[PDB]
Every structure is written in C-alpha cells, then in structure tokens.
Design a protein around this motif. Structure first.
Motif, PDB file in Angstrom:
ATOM      1  N   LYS A  65       0.830  -1.203   0.000  1.00 32.53           N
ATOM      2  CA  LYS A  65       0.000   0.000   0.000  1.00 32.53           C
ATOM      3  C   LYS A  65       0.864   1.253   0.000  1.00 32.53           C
ATOM      4  O   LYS A  65       0.463   2.285  -0.550  1.00 32.53           O
ATOM      5  CB  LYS A  65      -0.960   0.001   1.194  1.00 32.53           C
ATOM      6  CG  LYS A  65      -0.303   0.135   2.551  1.00 32.53           C
ATOM      7  CD  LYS A  65      -1.309   0.029   3.702  1.00 32.53           C
ATOM      8  CE  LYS A  65      -1.764  -1.420   3.935  1.00 32.53           C
ATOM      9  NZ  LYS A  65      -2.556  -1.635   5.161  1.00 32.53           N
ATOM     10  N   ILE A  66       2.043   1.187   0.624  1.00 37.54           N
ATOM     11  CA  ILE A  66       3.073   2.179   0.344  1.00 37.54           C
ATOM     12  C   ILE A  66       3.317   2.280  -1.154  1.00 37.54           C
ATOM     13  O   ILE A  66       3.103   3.338  -1.754  1.00 37.54           O
ATOM     14  CB  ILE A  66       4.371   1.818   1.089  1.00 37.54           C
ATOM     15  CG1 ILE A  66       4.193   2.002   2.591  1.00 37.54           C
ATOM     16  CG2 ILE A  66       5.547   2.647   0.574  1.00 37.54           C
ATOM     17  CD1 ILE A  66       5.280   1.326   3.421  1.00 37.54           C
ATOM     18  N   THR A  67       3.741   1.185  -1.783  1.00 42.20           N
ATOM     19  CA  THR A  67       4.148   1.230  -3.179  1.00 42.20           C
ATOM     20  C   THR A  67       2.993   1.069  -4.160  1.00 42.20           C
ATOM     21  O   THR A  67       3.223   1.123  -5.372  1.00 42.20           O
ATOM     22  CB  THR A  67       5.193   0.152  -3.440  1.00 42.20           C
ATOM     23  OG1 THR A  67       4.662  -1.125  -3.073  1.00 42.20           O
ATOM     24  CG2 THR A  67       6.445   0.442  -2.643  1.00 42.20           C
ATOM     25  N   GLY A  68       1.768   0.869  -3.682  1.00 39.85           N
ATOM     26  CA  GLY A  68       0.615   0.777  -4.544  1.00 39.85           C
ATOM     27  C   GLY A  68       0.336  -0.599  -5.114  1.00 39.85           C
ATOM     28  O   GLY A  68      -0.800  -0.859  -5.519  1.00 39.85           O
ATOM     29  N   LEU A  69       1.325  -1.487  -5.151  1.00 39.48           N
ATOM     30  CA  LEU A  69       1.119  -2.827  -5.681  1.00 39.48           C
ATOM     31  C   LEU A  69       0.245  -3.644  -4.729  1.00 39.48           C
ATOM     32  O   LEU A  69      -0.258  -3.152  -3.715  1.00 39.48           O
ATOM     33  CB  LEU A  69       2.462  -3.523  -5.913  1.00 39.48           C
ATOM     34  CG  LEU A  69       3.367  -3.037  -7.047  1.00 39.48           C
ATOM     35  CD1 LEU A  69       4.678  -3.807  -7.044  1.00 39.48           C
ATOM     36  CD2 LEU A  69       2.679  -3.207  -8.376  1.00 39.48           C
ATOM     37  N   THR A  70       0.051  -4.912  -5.085  1.00 38.04           N
ATOM     38  CA  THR A  70      -0.597  -5.896  -4.242  1.00 38.04           C
ATOM     39  C   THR A  70       0.308  -7.111  -4.123  1.00 38.04           C
ATOM     40  O   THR A  70       1.222  -7.307  -4.928  1.00 38.04           O
ATOM     41  CB  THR A  70      -1.945  -6.317  -4.817  1.00 38.04           C
ATOM     42  OG1 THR A  70      -1.734  -7.084  -6.009  1.00 38.04           O
ATOM     43  CG2 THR A  70      -2.766  -5.082  -5.163  1.00 38.04           C
ATOM     44  N   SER A  71       0.031  -7.931  -3.108  1.00 38.28           N
ATOM     45  CA  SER A  71       0.830  -9.130  -2.880  1.00 38.28           C
ATOM     46  C   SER A  71       0.830 -10.042  -4.094  1.00 38.28           C
ATOM     47  O   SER A  71       1.824 -10.723  -4.358  1.00 38.28           O
ATOM     48  CB  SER A  71       0.309  -9.897  -1.665  1.00 38.28           C
ATOM     49  OG  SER A  71      -0.977 -10.436  -1.908  1.00 38.28           O
TER      50      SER A  71
END
Ligand SMILES: [Cu+2]
Ligand SMILES: [Cu+2]
Lengths: 130, 119, 130
Positions: free
Chosen positions: A8-14
């Motif tokens: 959520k910092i970097t906007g991606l997802t697992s």
C-alpha cells in the motif's frame, strides 16, 4: 516486514509482487517461521524501481536488468543511458506508426458521408470486393 | 547452544523474523537489530570461551571454574528462555539419555534375566 | 475452397483463421465429406475485411461486429464513422501519452552523464530514494 503495508506504500498488491518475485526480478525476501514474506528496505526500493521501469517502459526483462544494476556498484551509467535512448527510439517509432494509423483512419473517416447509409465507402473499401 | 543457534539465524546473512523475538530479549527487570544482538551475544560467548578450559582445573566442579560456570548461568538467568527450537535442545539431551539409559537396560537385557545376579 | 486457398488469397495463417472462425467473427463454413471447411468467396471477403479491421487496430470483437455489418445491408455509414472516430480518440490518447512519457525519458537522459558512472541520477530517481 508485513506485506500489505509495503504494497500500500508502493501501490502494488501481494499478487503482483509475487508475480514479479517468481520472475526473479528482485531480491527474494525471506519468509518467517509462519511464512510471511519478510520485506526490507532493499526489497522496498528494488520494488519501486521494478515498478517505475515498466512505467517508463523497460519491460520485465529490461526492468530486471535495471534492478540487477541497482545491486551492482560497478554499474555503467553509460549503458543505462543507451538503454534509455534505445527505448526512446522504440517509443518514437511506436508514435510514428500510430500516427500513420490515425492518418489513414481519418482519411477513411472524412471521406465517409456519415449519412446513416448502408453504402459506407469505408466498409466496402476495407474488403477486396467489387 | 544459543551461541550456535545465533550463528544459525544469521547463517544466511540475515533474519528479522520472529526467531529473534524468541531469543535473548531482556525484559525490563520489536525486531532486534544486528548491533543489539552482537552486543548481547558477546558476553555470553566470553563466558563460553573462558569457562571451558578451567573445568579441567583439578576437578570438573572446581570452585573457581565452577563459579565461572555460575557467572555464565546467572548472566543467562536475567535473560529469558528461548522458543520451541529449545525443545530440540532439551530433546537433544533426551536423545542422550534415550540412548544412555536404554543401553544400561540393553546391558541388563543381556545380564540380569538369564543367570542369577544380586541386586 | 479449403483454408489454404482463402488463406493464400487473403493472407492469414491457418491457426488464426480457425481462431477467427471459432470466435464467431466469420460465418460458419460448410463442411465436406470429411469435415473440410468448404469456403467460398463470401468467406474470403469476410476474412479480407476482418484483417483490414484488425490491422487498423480494432480489437477482435469490434472487427467481428464490423464484418457482421458487411452482411447487414441495413448498416449505417454513420455508425462506421463514429466507430472510426472513437478509435481515433484511443489512438490520440495513446500517442500523446507515449510522447509525454518519452519527454520525461528525454529529461532524465539529459540528467544522466552516461559515462560508465556508478552514481547515475536515474537509478537514484526511479528508485524510491531521497
Ligand atoms: Cu460510409
Ligand atoms: Cu548516469
């Protein structure tokens, strides 16, 4: 680290992160005894690079090369700028052929009457009939 | 010993997972850094290196070397016990007696039943 | 006509032809003694049109529905031209995005010394650093 926090910092997802990981394009974060992907700062900034590289347009492989340079302290900025301007050239040619597209599209459009007719010149000229 | 497991946890160049959160961790009488661990694991390794060769000193429980052992212990006593892996360390002693004890039984299995023997 | 005839007249690959068939883009070709698809000139014009909708850039479904329009003489040249202009809108957004991101590529290329240096500014820029 915990994983959602980093994503959520970097906007991606697992899920996307694990795709990238399976592509071998970053440092493998360790797990824990429980199995949580142990992230770090190195993993964080490597991920940030691997993100923004495809945004720039360096693909999976090429963004991975940017990453393994990010690990390399010898890295040639010379090379880096060759990679840069090469991708600049591909994006240029992409733009140019898309311009050829839009040119022909508008050539076909402006000739068409647009008078809700079945005798559309575009349709019949796209087929090799008559 | 936890010296050896501390070589293990940092064997692959790193860990901040909960294996360390079970390790030494002095409570006031939280992923640990490398600095803090190397500091905490230095004095107990000092007691290790000084405490063994003195056991030779005229008796395994010789008062000087035995009070050095007491320092090793009491220094470990302010610190806490360590996680489930330590069960292996206990089991790694059980497996000693599991053999040793059993071997006596095994010797008894050849000795005490067949012919007469006092007790 | 077999797949080979209409193929080497229009210019598709057989796998892609059978694909566009299974997609329903084109009509059902009638079958032979043994299941060979007996094509016609209708099917050939359909595949020509379907290419010339595809290579223009229209996706599979848009090209297919246009091919279906070719067989509907109730069709409207107006619909054809607004379709053209919506695709033009897509191409405009795509090309201006390409130009913009290529402009920042140019900016950062100017930023780099490109001189075999370890400390390039770019690796420090895309990386979430400083
Ligand atoms: Cu028209
Ligand atoms: Cu540079």
């Amino acid at each position: 680290m915990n994983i959602s926090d980093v994503a959520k910092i970097t906007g991606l997802t697992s899920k996307a992160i694990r795709f990238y990981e399976e592509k071998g394009l970053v440092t493998p974060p360790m797990r824990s005894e429980n199995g949580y992907r142990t992230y770090t700062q190195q993993h964080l900034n490597e991920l940030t690079l691997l993100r923004q590289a495809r945004q720039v347009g360096f693909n999976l492989e090429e963004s991975g090369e940017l990453v393994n340079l990010f690990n390399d302290p010898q890295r040639h900025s010379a090379d880096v700028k060759r990679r840069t301007l090469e991708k600049v050239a591909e994006i240029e040619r992409h733009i140019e052929e898309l311009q050829s597209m839009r040119d022909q599209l508008l050539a076909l459009a402006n000739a068409c009457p647009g008078d809700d007719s079945a005798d559309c010149p575009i349709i019949e000229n796209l087929s090799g009939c008559c | 010993y936890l010296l050896e497991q501390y070589d293990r946890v940092e064997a692959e160049e790193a860990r901040l997972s909960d294996l360390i959160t079970g390790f030494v961790d002095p409570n006031a009488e939280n992923s640990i850094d490398p600095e803090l661990a190397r500091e905490k694991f230095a004095e107990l390794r000092a007691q290790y290196v000084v405490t063994r060769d003195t056991i030779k000193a005229k008796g395994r429980s010789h008062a000087t070397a035995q009070e050095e052992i007491l320092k090793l212990s009491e220094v470990f006593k302010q610190f806490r016990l360590v996680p489930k892996q330590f069960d292996y360390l206990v089991n790694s002693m059980r497996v000693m007696m599991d053999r040793v004890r059993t071997q006596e039984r095994l010797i008894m299995k050849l000795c005490v039943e067949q012919c007469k023997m006092p007790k």
